[PDB]
Design a protein around this nucleic acid. Structure first.
Ligand SMILES: [K+]
Ligand SMILES: [K+]
Length: 116
DNA sequence: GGTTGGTGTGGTTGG
């Protein structure tokens, strides 16, 4: 069926940059809405970004101008480029994809940003 | 729980 596989998490220094990938199988990103969320240590889950089937993007106020979404249809993969990272960005990052009446989730990947 | 956490039926996300 439908499965999402996230990759790219790890440890980085403040001010650094890294890219998360969300690779889909069983359904195309270009068919539906995909979303990123993050879950920081002492916080509730928060929206990060959305890309619609048509490729249009929206970003949360806490990441706008630093994070950007792109999509490779031939690899059925969506990328979250995370620039100018801050310790406040430390969290588990999730991606999901809608398909029909269901929502399918990646396994989550930890990003840890060390203080300067 | 789930194909996903947890301060679990809200959450730029259903029940
Ligand atoms: K640190
Ligand atoms: K839930």
């Amino acid at each position: 069926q439908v499965q999402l596989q996230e990759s790219g998490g790890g440890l980085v220094q403040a001010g650094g940059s890294l890219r998360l990938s969300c690779a889909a199988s069983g359904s195309r990103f270009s068919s539906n809405t995909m979303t990123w969320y993050r879950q920081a240590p002492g916080k509730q889950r928060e929206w990060v970004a959305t890309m619609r089937s048509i490729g249009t993007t929206r970003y949360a106020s806490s990441v706008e101008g630093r994070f950007t979404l792109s999509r490779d249809n031939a690899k059925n993969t969506v990328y979250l480029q995370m620039n100018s990272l801050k310790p406040e960005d430390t969290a588990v990052y999730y991606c999901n994809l809608r398909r029909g009446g269901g929502i399918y989730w990646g396994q989550g990947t930890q990003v840890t940003v060390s203080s300067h």
